[PDB]
């Protein structure tokens, strides 16, 4: 329908889907580079994670402060261009290093390989910052203005955005894997750069069309000084405790990451069962999104967080039982993980809506940058914990630690709900 193809909501969905497709393809490419030229060393993956996390921790407040002053179209297009240019310029380097692979591995002094590694990391670390900035500005500012007083429209928007993310997370790696299988990594990392170029152009035009469509988007109602001011202004926000609770859920190993997949591999599983496991995780995620939508419609915005916390903790009780009780253990563990996905996703959806609905119109970027900073602080702590404990039994301890941290986060959200209602 012409109406549902010109309204300024399908264009947001299309732009977001293109962006996430490119992002996930590029992430898969970097993972392949790591596993090929370094043998997926857990230490180097953890160092890469620490670099990204620390970089967003020290700089989230500054990026949010920058977003809060300038104009929306300007900042959106600048962030988009920086992201896509960085991704293209790194895909070219990945192509070159994939071509002359064995040369580097076997007939060059190690310092050139080290330099290539730190260069790829330093470019990915800027791509990640640009993606963070576009996330802040589009999700937390543009999505909230393109749907006005109505509160169900915003919820549907967030839900379908999360569904798009969930689908692409499993669709894009498969496509790039096929292209690298029936071709070569030198072709995959070139298809990625071409995709990102054409996508940058199309998304630029789509952003301009959106900005032309809604006139209510041009009316901006709005060293260390800004950093400290932002953090202290985030401390005393009415939703500080719910935001802290959401932050706490990133300290976890119960998911699909660099360590738990290696654990599964050690438990003698197959590729196909892992693929269908990821598919089941995506199915449960979509279930969680629709469950959040219905709950929010019926009971209320705030108690949905409590329901989701109870669900996640209920499944994590199986997750923690899985440690003490050679197939029952791993089956219960994976069942608990895939079931708790529902509560996890619906809880973070409702916390996101709490964030982007109460805070003042002239401080979205700064406190959302601080929220990203806290999420990445806990992610940095997670990676630190993984570094010191690589052994398999240590995983039997990390499960307990992760459930404890989830319990802490939901205790904090319960305190918030008691203060409010």
């Amino acid at each position, epitope marked *: 329908l012409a109406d549902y193809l010109t309204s300024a909501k399908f264009l947001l969905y299309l732009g977001h889907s293109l962006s996430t497709w490119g992002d996930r393809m590029w992430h898969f490419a970097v993972s392949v580079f790591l*596993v*090929e030229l*370094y043998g997926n*060393s857990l230490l180097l993956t953890a160092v890469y994670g620490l670099v990204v996390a620390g970089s967003v921790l020290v700089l989230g407040a500054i990026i949010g402060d920058w977003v809060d002053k300038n104009a929306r179209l300007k900042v959106a297009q600048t962030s988009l261009v920086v992201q896509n240019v960085s991704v293209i310029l790194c895909g070219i380097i990945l192509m070159m290093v994939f*071509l002359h692979k*064995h040369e580097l*591995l*076997t*007939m060059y002094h190690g310092w050139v390989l080290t330099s290539c590694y730190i260069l790829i990391i330093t470019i990915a670390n800027i791509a990640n910052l640009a993606s963070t900035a576009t996330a802040i500005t589009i999700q937390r500012d543009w999505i909230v203005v393109v749907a006005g007083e109505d509160r169900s429209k915003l919820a549907n928007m967030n839900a379908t955005i999360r569904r798009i993310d969930q689908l692409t997370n499993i669709l894009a790696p498969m496509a790039v894997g096929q292209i690298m299988t029936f071709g*070569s990594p030198v072709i995959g990392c070139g298809f990625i750069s071409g995709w990102n170029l054409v996508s940058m152009c199309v998304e630029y035009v789509l952003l301009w069309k959106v900005y032309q469509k809604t006139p209510a988007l041009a009316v901006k109602a709005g060293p260390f000084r800004t950093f400290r001011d932002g953090w202290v202004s985030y401390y005393n926000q009415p939703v500080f405790l719910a935001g802290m609770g959401l932050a706490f859920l990133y300290m976890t190993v119960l998911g699909f990451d660099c360590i738990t997949t290696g654990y599964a591999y050690t438990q003698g599983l197959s590729g196909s069962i892992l693929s269908i496991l990821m598919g089941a995780s995506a199915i449960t995620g979509i279930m969680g999104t629709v469950a959040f939508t219905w709950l929010r419609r019926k009971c209320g915005l705030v108690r949905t967080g409590l329901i989701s916390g109870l669900a996640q903790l209920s499944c994590l009780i199986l997750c923690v039982i899985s440690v003490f009780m050679p197939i029952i253990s791993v089956s219960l563990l994976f069942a608990g993980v895939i079931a708790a996905r529902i509560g996890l996703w619906s809880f973070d959806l409702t916390v996101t809506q709490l964030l982007q609905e109460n805070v003042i119109e002239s401080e979205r970027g700064i406190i959302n940058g601080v929220q990203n900073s806290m999420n990445y602080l806990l992610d940095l702590l997670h990676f630190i914990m993984v570094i010191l404990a690589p052994n398999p039994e240590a995983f039997g301890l990390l499960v307990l630690i992760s459930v404890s941290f989830v319990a802490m986060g939901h205790i904090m959200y319960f305190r918030f709900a008691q203060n409010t209602l």
Partner: antibody
Amino acid sequence: EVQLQESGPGLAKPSQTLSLTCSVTGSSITSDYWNWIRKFPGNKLEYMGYISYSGSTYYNPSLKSQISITRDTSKNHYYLQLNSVTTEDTATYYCARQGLRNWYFDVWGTGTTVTVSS
Amino acid sequence: DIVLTQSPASLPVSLGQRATISCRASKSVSASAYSYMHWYQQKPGQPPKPLIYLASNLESGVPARFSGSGSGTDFTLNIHPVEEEDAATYYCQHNRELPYTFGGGTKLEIK
């Protein structure tokens, strides 16, 4: 379809010069490494050196003879020149093309014998 | 420099059976996810031929009776089943660092 073919002289005298040509039909010499290998009378193969796809060059330091691995990019040829030959140069010389996709001597030539005497 | 010791000298076998030849290095010839140990087949009167590359792969067109396996410093090539034409010489060559080196050669025969 890649093909190599050697050429050169039959025999030589002590303290002379040998200029073995290798002609490559089906692919340029500006793609992957081009190596000179020699099998002695017997079984012990031996690596002599290579010329790269970018004018680089390398000689086996364990070799007791002066070798020069040159190339001519017009006729699509590359040359091995042995100087100051000796009674321990009699061997069978093969070309090979160390590729860049799988990193092994994947295409050889028929090879030519060389013997020194009086 | 890396020295590849090949064993045994000559390997007699009988048709239909399975034959195993192995050459051991003196250092590690394996980098991240890749091991540089290739196997060559040379009949009397012809240049060598590529059977296995990167110690576990198979060339385009070689009979599937040839299998490669190994890592670290010990490798192994298996033929099953042998034929009357497999009486040849088999070499193992590494690529880890210059200068490259070839094995001693296993003089397979048929009884």
